[PDB]
Amino acid sequence: GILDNKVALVTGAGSGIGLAVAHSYAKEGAKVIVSDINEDHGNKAVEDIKAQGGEASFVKADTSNPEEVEALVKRTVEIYGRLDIACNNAGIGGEQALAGDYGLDSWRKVLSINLDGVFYGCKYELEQMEKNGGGVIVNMASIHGIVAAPLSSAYTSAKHAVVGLTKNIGAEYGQKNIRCNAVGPAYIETPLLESLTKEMKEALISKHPMGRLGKPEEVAELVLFLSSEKSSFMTGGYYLVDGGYTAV
Amino acid sequence: GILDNKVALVTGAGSGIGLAVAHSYAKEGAKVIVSDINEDHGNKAVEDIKAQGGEASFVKADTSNPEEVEALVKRTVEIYGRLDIACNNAGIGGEQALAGDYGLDSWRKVLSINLDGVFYGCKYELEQMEKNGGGVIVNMASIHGIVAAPLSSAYTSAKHAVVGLTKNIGAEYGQKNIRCNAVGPAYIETPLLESLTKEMKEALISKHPMGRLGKPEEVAELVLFLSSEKSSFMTGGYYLVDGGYTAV
Amino acid sequence: GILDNKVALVTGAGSGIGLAVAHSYAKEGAKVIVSDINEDHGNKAVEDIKAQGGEASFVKADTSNPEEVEALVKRTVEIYGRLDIACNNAGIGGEQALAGDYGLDSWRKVLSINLDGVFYGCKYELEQMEKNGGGVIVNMASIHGIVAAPLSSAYTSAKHAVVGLTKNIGAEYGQKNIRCNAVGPAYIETPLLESLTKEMKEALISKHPMGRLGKPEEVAELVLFLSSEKSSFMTGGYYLVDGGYTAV
Amino acid sequence: GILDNKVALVTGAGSGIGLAVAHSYAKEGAKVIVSDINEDHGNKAVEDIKAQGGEASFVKADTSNPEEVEALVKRTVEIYGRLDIACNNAGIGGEQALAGDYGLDSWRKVLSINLDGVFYGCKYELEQMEKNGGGVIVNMASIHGIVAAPLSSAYTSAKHAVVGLTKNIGAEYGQKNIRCNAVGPAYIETPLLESLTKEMKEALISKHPMGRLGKPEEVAELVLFLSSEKSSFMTGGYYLVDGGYTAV
Numbered sequence: 003g004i005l006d007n008k009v010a011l012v013t014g015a016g017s018g019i020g021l022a023v024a025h026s027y028a029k030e031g032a033k034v035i036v037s038d039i040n041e042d043h044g045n046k047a048v049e050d051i052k053a054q055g056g057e058a059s060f061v062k063a064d065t066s067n068p069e070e071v072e073a074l075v076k077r078t079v080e081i082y083g084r085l086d087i088a089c090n091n092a093g094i095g096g097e098q099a100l101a102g103d104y105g106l107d108s109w110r111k112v113l114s115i116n117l118d119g120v121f122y123g124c125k126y127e128l129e130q131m132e133k134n135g136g137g138v139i140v141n142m143a144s145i146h147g148i149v150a151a152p153l154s155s156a157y158t159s160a161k162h163a164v165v166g167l168t169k170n171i172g173a174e175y176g177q178k179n180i181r182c183n184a185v186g187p188a189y190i191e192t193p194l195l196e197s198l199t200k201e202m203k204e205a206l207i208s209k210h211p212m213g214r215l216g217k218p219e220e221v222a223e224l225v226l227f228l229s230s231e232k233s234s235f236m237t238g239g240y241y242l243v244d245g246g247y248t249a250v
Numbered sequence: 251g252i253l254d255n256k257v258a259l260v261t262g263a264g265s266g267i268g269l270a271v272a273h274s275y276a277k278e279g280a281k282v283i284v285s286d287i288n289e290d291h292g293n294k295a296v297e298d299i300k301a302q303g304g305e306a307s308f309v310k311a312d313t314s315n316p317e318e319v320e321a322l323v324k325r326t327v328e329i330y331g332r333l334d335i336a337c338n339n340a341g342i343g344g345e346q347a348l349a350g351d352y353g354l355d356s357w358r359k360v361l362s363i364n365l366d367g368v369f370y371g372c373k374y375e376l377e378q379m380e381k382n383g384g385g386v387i388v389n390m391a392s393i394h395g396i397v398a399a400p401l402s403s404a405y406t407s408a409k410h411a412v413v414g415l416t417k418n419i420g421a422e423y424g425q426k427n428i429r430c431n432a433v434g435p436a437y438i439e440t441p442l443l444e445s446l447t448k449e450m451k452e453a454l455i456s457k458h459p460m461g462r463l464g465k466p467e468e469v470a471e472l473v474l475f476l477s478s479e480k481s482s483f484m485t486g487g488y489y490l491v492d493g494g495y496t497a498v
Numbered sequence: 499g500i501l502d503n504k505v506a507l508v509t510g511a512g513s514g515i516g517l518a519v520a521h522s523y524a525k526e527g528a529k530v531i532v533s534d535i536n537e538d539h540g541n542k543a544v545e546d547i548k549a550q551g552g553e554a555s556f557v558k559a560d561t562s563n564p565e566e567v568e569a570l571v572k573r574t575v576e577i578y579g580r581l582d583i584a585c586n587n588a589g590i591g592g593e594q595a596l597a598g599d600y601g602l603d604s605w606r607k608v609l610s611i612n613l614d615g616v617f618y619g620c621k622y623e624l625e626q627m628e629k630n631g632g633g634v635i636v637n638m639a640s641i642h643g644i645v646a647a648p649l650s651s652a653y654t655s656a657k658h659a660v661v662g663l664t665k666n667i668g669a670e671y672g673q674k675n676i677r678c679n680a681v682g683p684a685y686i687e688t689p690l691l692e693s694l695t696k697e698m699k700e701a702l703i704s705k706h707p708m709g710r711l712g713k714p715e716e717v718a719e720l721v722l723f724l725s726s727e728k729s730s731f732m733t734g735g736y737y738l739v740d741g742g743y744t745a746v
Numbered sequence: 747g748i749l750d751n752k753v754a755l756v757t758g759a760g761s762g763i764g765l766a767v768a769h770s771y772a773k774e775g776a777k778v779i780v781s782d783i784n785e786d787h788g789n790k791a792v793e794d795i796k797a798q799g800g801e802a803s804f805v806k807a808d809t810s811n812p813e814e815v816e817a818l819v820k821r822t823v824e825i826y827g828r829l830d831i832a833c834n835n836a837g838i839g840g841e842q843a844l845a846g847d848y849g850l851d852s853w854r855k856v857l858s859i860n861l862d863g864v865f866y867g868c869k870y871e872l873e874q875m876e877k878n879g880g881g882v883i884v885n886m887a888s889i890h891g892i893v894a895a896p897l898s899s900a901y902t903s904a905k906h907a908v909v910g911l912t913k914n915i916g917a918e919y920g921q922k923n924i925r926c927n928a929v930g931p932a933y934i935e936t937p938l939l940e941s942l943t944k945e946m947k948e949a950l951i952s953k954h955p956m957g958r959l960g961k962p963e964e965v966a967e968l969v970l971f972l973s974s975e976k977s978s979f980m981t982g983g984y985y986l987v988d989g990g991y992t993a994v
Binding site for chain 1: 370403
């Protein structure tokens with residue numbers, strides 16, 4: 003596999019996109035730290051990856067706490083000796099409300115996880131990668147890092163910020179054997195989204211020129227590509243996996 | 251004056267861009283609340299505006315504190331009866347350091363002021379605007395809302411987030427007689443740039459195809475246009491005043 | 499007016515946006531060369547301009563012919579002595595078809611008028627402006643200079659090209675007292691729209707967060723801004739007048 | 747092999763990026779049609795591909811001639827039965843001059859190859875892919891599909907149009923089992939660049955945060971990814987391989 007001998011960290015890897023990323027990375031021979039705030043989801047993920055022949059180990063962390071993220075990376079190096087690859091994926095949707103109605107605490111919660119937690123990841127990841135000869139970071143953005151999601155101004159702002167942070171890191175670290183890029187998924191099938199009224203699901207689908215929602219594995223293939231040597235001249239970029247959503 | 255009997259609020263209005271915007275608004279007949287964290291600067295601006303034939307009043311605020319921002323909009327309505335226009339301009343540059351070395355506190359501070367404070371302003375501005383038949387908001391972003399500034403990853407992130415927030419507000423309030431746009435200046439000549447050496451100044455200048463830095467008045471002109479009825483079909487947009495910087 | 503004694507050229511100024519731009523420029527004191535492929539429309543526009551106190555002259559030109567555009571600019575200099583401002587507005591929409599079905603001749607025709615004609619304009623405009631101390635160009639793009647219009651691939655491709663051209667010119671001429679920017683209108687009201695049933699108007703309206711189409715005068719207001727000294731530090735940029743269309 | 751039994755067309759495949767794409771496609775099991783205007787280069791690429799163990803054939807074509815492009819696709823179908831993948835790569839750099847000094851012929855020649863040839867390619871490719879249950883197209887753009895290249899306005903304009911064409915095709919064909927994306931390389935090592943002086947090469951390198959030029963293989967890996975089923979939820983997008991160039 004293309005990540006043989008590499009150590010990879012994934013945040014929010016207990017479900018959806020993060021899990022699919024943890025699976026891809028393990029399937030290509032990485033030793034994967036599965037991180038999540040939820041221990042049940044985290045352990046199930048490690049057992050499923052072990053079951054299918056991979057090396058994974060679970061480390062609990064809330065990305066909005068910088069001490070827990072520093073401790074995650076520290077533990078990664080304890081369990082596996084190094085850090086080569088990180089996907090900063092943990093995120094929340096947040097309250098839905100018009101910006102003028104948007105809660106103060108709800109705003110801060112979304113920004114602390116979706117932005118600050120990504121920044122904390124990057125910071126301790128970069129610190130480690132400089133000790134072990136470099137590495138590659140993938141930041142999970144969204145189509146909402148470039149276009150609005152009405153009623154989700156916090157999410158949008160946080161995802162835009164992630165894009166900007168990615169550009170900064172890719173530029174700053176270009177000659178330091180570190181790459182950093184962002185991925186921008188549109189709407190992706192998860193159990194939550196199957197709950198919607200058929201007409202609401204069809205309204206969302208009609209925003210994607212491909213005429214369906216994405217699958218977590220389709221995001222994960224892009225993440226894998228940007229985390230491997232195949233993307234060796236790619237850095238500071240934002241990469242859509244959007245079904246055409248932003249083309250119109 | 252194209253803003254006759256409008257009431258305008260400007261944050262960080264004591265110096266630089268904010269001061270020029272406050273002047274331009276007053277020159278066009280607006281009643282202006284000059285807000286700044288610094289009372290001497292703010293009071294000085296109000297006198298200068300009044301000396302030139304305009305109407306203005308000073309209200310102290312730290313935009314990172316949501317209570318102070320709510321109080322500012324309140325006080326605007328107490329003094330002039332309504333809020334028609336707002337320019338969310340207060341910001342800081344922040345620590346300059348590699349993202350891996352960037353301070354946790356320095357990161358929070360830049361994001362607090364440059365993003366949360368803009369959000370707080372927009373939140374309380376929108377709330378009032380819906381009570382007085384709508385209005386117009388201009389958010390001060392930067393070229394760094396779309397391109398990196400090496401060593402200023404917090405600043406970049408925050409300004410990207412401002413561009414996102416703007417798109418969201420413009421999208422959400424499209425049918426509510428409220429417009430919201432963002433301005434992206436490049437580097438602007440202010441007395442605070444006479445602590446650059448000759449070589450550091452020429453280096454900044456060489457990044458602008460126009461071969462000079464911008465003036466605060468030239469940024470204010472764009473703010474003015476975006477705040478008036480002349481820009482009636484412009485909302486959610488990002489508008490460069492960059493001397494060519496981002497064309498290459 | 500703000501354009502007092504400037505000499506301004508507008509292509510395709512017999513109808514819609516160009517007409518509004520020609521009115522705006524003339525209302526603000528410019529000497530306006532009205533150009534169009536239709537003599538009746540053109541002369542009609544010049545007479546209409548003069549009826550409100552304006553100075554204008556008609557000059558026929560087909561912008562797909564470089565010789566005609568070069569002679570258009572010679573003729574402008576003959577009539578008014580110089581060229582200060584040019585708006586390259588002349589366009590067509592082309593046939594509606596899937597890219598795979600798109601006519602070879604229709605592709606050619608759209609690119610020839612909407613791109614080559616803009617290039618011709620800029621080439622011969624720049625030549626003359628370097629003889630007379632500089633000046634300002636505005637190129638008419640569209641939202642479809644940055645997002646797709648399904649079934650109108652030629653139009654989209656040409657307007658994308660116009661944005662790229664504009665960046666090049668802004669950057670190339672930044673120290674030669676020449677500015678060049680591009681305007682991106684969304685969908686605009688035309689005479690025909692009033693004739694349609696409710697459902698046919700509302701079709702486009704729903705893609706604009708502002709809940710209406712734009713008026714040609716609202717586009718001309720941004721073109722005027724970008725044509726005057728008010729925008730003196732703006733060059734190489736793309737400027738939306740889109741009602742929020744591209745924010746989502 | 748990830749393209750096993752797929753039929754892949756590459757234009758301008760005699761050298762540089764196109765040659766690397768053809769090698770990558772063939773290595774992954776595709777039956778490759780190498781197209782080039784130069785027979786000697788084309789035949790040599792086929793021999794080199796066959797020598798590694800791949801399947802390929804040469805079809806001569808000038809992409810600026812739409813009949814030749816039609817015939818190229820017809821011939822691909824005669825040789826290998828179908829068309830699944832196409833990479834529209836043939837391009838030229840064109841004359842270097844200020845926009846106001848740019849030759850009329852040079853402009854047309856650059857646009858004819860860089861844009862029109864890409865459209866002709868997509869036209870006849872889409873026409874065939876609709877007969878054989880779909881396919882995937884990659885259009886070669888450049889960093890200059892989004893940022894200017896002073897003295898190369900025709901190139902910039904044409905690559906911008908490619909980006910727009912791509913968005914259109916991805917949007918239009920989304921539910922028709924056809925994907926279309928564009929690739930945006932920065933400066934890539936070629937014999938030409940290699941020769942150009944130590945001082946100029948350094949100046950160009952220093953515009954890339956990664957501190958080197960790209961290799962054609964590095965571009966090809968992104969093309970391969972975008973042509974494979976791994977990118978199944980990616981369409982209408984623009985994908986950088988720029989070493990960080992556009993991040994600042």
